């Protein structure tokens, strides 16, 4: 089994997960919705349309009484029509972010770090931790993020499957999902990501690194103590491979979001801090 330190490391992680991850999205309300409606910048738009392109989603709002509101976004054309779902997303992302921040807070190993670092880490891992939480509510069978009463569905497009997979973000959710991971391994993934000793601004590199290794090691043992099936050989390695891919998708997504924010500002105050949105 796991050492007694390990066994309790997973517990504080799980506890933190349970106290800050509103898996039913019951406290997510008062959010915005789509209404009931020149050479340099030109190239910029061309890129934005390519950035928001295969991230297009449908929004469904199943109500208490049994009513069902459904929003199908506009197909590509003109301009502003490709930003109609951005304000709502900004509210989801912000709601998700607040949760992440809480998560890091109750974690004892995080609190014992210099606030500067605690910020560097949150700054450099939010999106990542957010993707890991969303994955738990992703239904790969229907390409839809089931978030309590509201759900986000993927819009089929050019090339279809093999095409969507060209979108790192999309591929990341489908491959991660394929690994059918436990809550314990998801929360360990979050910790390992949170304590990345290589994020910009991080001061105590040697300590954080010591911490990431501690978690990485717990995950590795956990997998051995709970999945000896020769089939699960390399599972730990597949996950680390995933975290690395996620870190790469996160770097691009930031650049992706800036390009968008540049053309059509939308980020919330908090998002601005987290993404360093210039002003």
């Amino acid at each position: 089994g796991l050492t007694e330190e390990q066994r309790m490391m997973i517990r504080e992680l799980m506890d933190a997960q349970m106290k800050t991850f509103d898996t039913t999205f019951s406290h997510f309300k008062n959010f915005r919705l789509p209404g009931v409606l020149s050479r340099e910048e030109a190239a910029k738009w061309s890129q934005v349309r390519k950035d928001l392109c295969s991230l297009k989603v449908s929004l469904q709002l199943r109500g208490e009484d049994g009513s069902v509101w459904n929003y199908k976004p506009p197909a590509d054309s003109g301009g502003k029509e490709i930003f109609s779902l951005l304000p709502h997303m900004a509210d989801m992302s912000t709601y998700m972010f607040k949760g992440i921040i809480s998560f890091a807070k109750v974690i004892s190993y995080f609190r014992d770090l210099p606030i500067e670092d605690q910020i560097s880490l949150l700054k450099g891992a939010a999106f990542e931790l957010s993707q890991l939480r969303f994955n738990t509510v992703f239904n790969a069978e229907t390409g839809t993020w089931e978030c309590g009463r509201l759900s986000y569905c993927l819009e089929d497009t050019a090339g279809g499957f093999q095409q969507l997979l060209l979108e790192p973000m999309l591929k990341f959710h489908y491959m991660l999902k394929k690994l059918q991971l436990h809550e314990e391994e998801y929360v360990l993934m979050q910790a390992i990501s949170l304590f990345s000793p290589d994020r910009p601004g991080v001061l105590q590199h040697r300590v954080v690194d010591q911490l990431q290794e501690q978690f990485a090691i717990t995950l590795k043992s956990y997998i051995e103590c709970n999945r000896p099936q020769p089939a699960h050989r390399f599972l730990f390695l597949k996950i680390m491979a995933m975290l690395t891919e996620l870190r790469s998708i996160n770097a691009q997504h930031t650049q992706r979001l800036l390009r968008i924010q540049d053309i059509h500002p939308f980020a919330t105050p908090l998002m601005q801090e987290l993404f360093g949105i210039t002003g």
């Binding site: 921040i101 910020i119 560097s120 949150l122 601004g201 105050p269 801090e273 987290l274």
Partner: peptide, 15 residues
Amino acid sequence: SLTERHKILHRLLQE
């Protein structure tokens, strides 16, 4: 400051 450039985030860090 890094703290000074993250009001809310920091503001959220203590409660």
